[PDB]
Amino acid sequence: VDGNYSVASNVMVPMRDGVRLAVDLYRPDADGPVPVLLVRNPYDKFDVFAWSTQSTNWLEFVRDGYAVVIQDTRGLFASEGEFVPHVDDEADAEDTLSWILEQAWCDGNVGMFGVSYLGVTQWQAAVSGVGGLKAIAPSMASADLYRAPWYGPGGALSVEALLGWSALIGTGLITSRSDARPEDAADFVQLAAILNDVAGAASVTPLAEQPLLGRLIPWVIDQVVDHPDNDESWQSISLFERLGGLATPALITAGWYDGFVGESLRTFVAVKDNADARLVVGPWSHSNLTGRNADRKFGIAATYPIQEATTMHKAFFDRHLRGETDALAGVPKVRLFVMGIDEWRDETDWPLPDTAYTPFYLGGSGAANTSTGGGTLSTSISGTESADTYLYDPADPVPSLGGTLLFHNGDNGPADQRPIHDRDDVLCYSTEVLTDPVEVTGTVSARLFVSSSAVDTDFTAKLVDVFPDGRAIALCDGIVRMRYRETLVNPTLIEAGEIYEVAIDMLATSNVFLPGHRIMVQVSSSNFPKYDRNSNTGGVIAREQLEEMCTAVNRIHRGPEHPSHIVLPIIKRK
């Protein structure tokens, strides 16, 4: 009977090493084999409500004649084995895909879908070379784990992401275990204490000493904290260089305030030439898909459009798993939520064709320190040679507010920045009030001429939309850790007092700055706990006591011979 199905729980699937993973099978009432969709999940396959509201109404797929397989990852919940993040997922996915393809009920066409960790596992599956995998749909995902979510393109540790995720998975690992232990109860309390106060947890020095988290999940230290360079340990689990040779259709979803955004978008660019790639980007953070934030509301249309997403996924899988050649007729290649106008808009490509990468130069009379300083932004090079100077003290970093926070206050992406504007280490540069709209849609970066009293330090840049009422709404930001200015792989220190031209990767945005608004850039040397704090020593940052760290007098140079600027992806639509 069409629309009817059955569910088989805890079907045990043998991996190559004999370890069995648990799956649930959602199989339609049908008279032959059917196309199959796989979801690989470290948060209990049973608990479908927890993640699905962030993805698709995927029971519609089953009602429409797809089978759906949901799997517990190795060493979690009903699965056998031992859990270590990322390292087993390529092989386990290959073996899982092979098993599905052998079953009576599978017609030889398999796809995947799902969000975050359920998205990363899809790239790991796609590089396996299993011919029966016809399409993937990675949402809020990354193909380079160093670049997201653990470190970043600037070479700073995403400390809140690491500690929050570890505490979340830690809670799962305890719940999953062979038999309850006497220390379980106290461990839960401590994990809850971390999740209630991630910035506090991230503030303890040395950072690398994590009694609880290091015991529950040794990987947190052995892999992540201990490998600050993008070295061979990271390349091993990286998929990105392999993406260019793939020919697998991918339905890619991202959020402007999502921790994975830079890497999600990069995956689209990497696969678009060789296969049918699609892109959907909304104004969401990892834990807030509602479109509603404390000081910024995007409208009901901004709410994660789960039924539209479900329709689009089904059309996509119909095209690639069911060979229906017209299934994606009328479906755009790219669909973006353009903030400011606060509207969804169809595009033919990402980056947008007809992006004008435009420098906006830092300038102004007198110090740009604080929002009441003299800092300006202009499409013209600054006429006079100036410098803004501040003290960066690791004991007092600039607090993270909005942006791409995951676990520490990760539900307020477009955060009002006014609470940090009277700080002396926050340099502010803004345009005049705009008489006419300026659209900024694409990847964003800064080029700054900088110097320091230290042999290492950080520089941050943050793009901000200043509203008529004074709200200064965060759009996108990045960091450069100076030892990694040239390379993430082979860092070198800087000479105190010497001027360097450095790039800051500020990820991406889509915003129309409307008449009455200003374009604003904040520059500093910290953004904590989004990124860990640079010790200003040149040492092994995660191994240093706070008292071992140094302050740094940092300087931004601006003028004709040091034309520091932000590069904005300008779109003009008449």
Next chain:
Amino acid sequence: VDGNYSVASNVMVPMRDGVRLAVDLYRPDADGPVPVLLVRNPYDKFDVFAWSTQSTNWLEFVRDGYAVVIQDTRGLFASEGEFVPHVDDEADAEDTLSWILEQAWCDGNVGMFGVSYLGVTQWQAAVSGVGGLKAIAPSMASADLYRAPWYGPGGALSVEALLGWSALIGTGLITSRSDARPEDAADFVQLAAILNDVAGAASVTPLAEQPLLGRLIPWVIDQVVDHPDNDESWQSISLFERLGGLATPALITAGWYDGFVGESLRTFVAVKDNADARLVVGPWSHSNLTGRNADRKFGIAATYPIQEATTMHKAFFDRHLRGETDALAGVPKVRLFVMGIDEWRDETDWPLPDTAYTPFYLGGSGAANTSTGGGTLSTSISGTESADTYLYDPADPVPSLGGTLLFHNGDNGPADQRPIHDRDDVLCYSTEVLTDPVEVTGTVSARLFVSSSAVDTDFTAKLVDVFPDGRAIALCDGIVRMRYRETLVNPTLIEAGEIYEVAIDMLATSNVFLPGHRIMVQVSSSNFPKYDRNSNTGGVIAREQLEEMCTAVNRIHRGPEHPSHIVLPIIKRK
């Protein structure tokens, strides 16, 4: 096989009038009949993800050997017939329960669960007298539709609730229809415009002229707007008086910032003596169960505890549907999230035994207008005869901020009240800074001595926790519409200038005001759009143009002969 199940979609169930309602059957793999749980849903039975995250991981029930039936209400989605809210649900539930009881797979024991509208339908089902209904679990529900969600104990229309819900259901009614209409597209846009701006929609006068909503759902005007008195049209759909004679176990869930809270709690009190009743109350609003708000965070333990709720529901149904006499061993009768200390706590009853209903009298030197006025609260009667006076202008009502808002900004219950504190029509009375904690847990009310220049007007009272940093966090509030001061059924007007002693029902809270905090009360004559604005004319409010309305000079009397006070349910736990 234990843990396995099947799903049959769109099974058509005949009602007494021959109209067929659509259900989905989730039936376990079993060798005999099983106990059955029913959910009655106006938001598409297919769309399980939309409501379930607010309820239970109910697939665990199916894996544990319960069948689950989810039904589309009459006239919506896959069901036949015509949709009108509330009026058909008693009969349709009786016929649905009868059909389930007749099926091969039902063992004669049926229960219900679910949230909001899926909770109200459970009281309607329980009064039907179907013996096979052994237990219900109404979450965020009401047994008196006048008192919640449409009007209230004070006799004011909950206008934002009415317009928001109508627009939501309107969107469903269009999606559900026989065949797409040319005007559907424009109707969707207009419904979206209402949902993006509920206060704007509520501001149009006369209120009763609703071209779009009145066309899509005539009931919005014919029943709700046209019947401001708690008259025979309301008693018809009211279940409350019938609750006292029931003997049906009920697992009742509520939220301190939920629109249905006063009525949810009343249902517990009404049934507790004759059957096994349970109560669970968290710090949630109808659309925000996260425990996180713009200016107030309750901790991760405050997040709606879906797996604990699932375990408790299953134990409850095991006890009452499966006759397992020890199933609820160790389960508390009452479990409350006590705000301030921000901890869950078990209790033996609601109201708490050992509640001291304590008057806190309004006082102070000079005007209590604004937060910088002289208004005080004290357990001692005020020594001097004073009065605070303000102008209430319907064209400029006090805006709603937090509280029990449903659709207009309904995701910020514990809202900071500072944005309205410099208003002259907001009278503020506060205690000294507390040296020691004061717990307020129970139902809350005010008794005010009031006078007006008008023949009708409103008075509002709002309890507030003032934090050390200045945040003035809303706790609970109510309203009295003066024509309904004595009765909701047979209103009479007041004489201008005459003093009346009036009661204001402020629903309920659980809060410890900690050392360093103040207890604060705000008094006014509007709270819009939580409640519609009184026109100050004595007229038919919903039929008046703004220009037809009058201003009112309103007065709060306080002193020895007019001891205006708030009654706080004080708990002392040494």
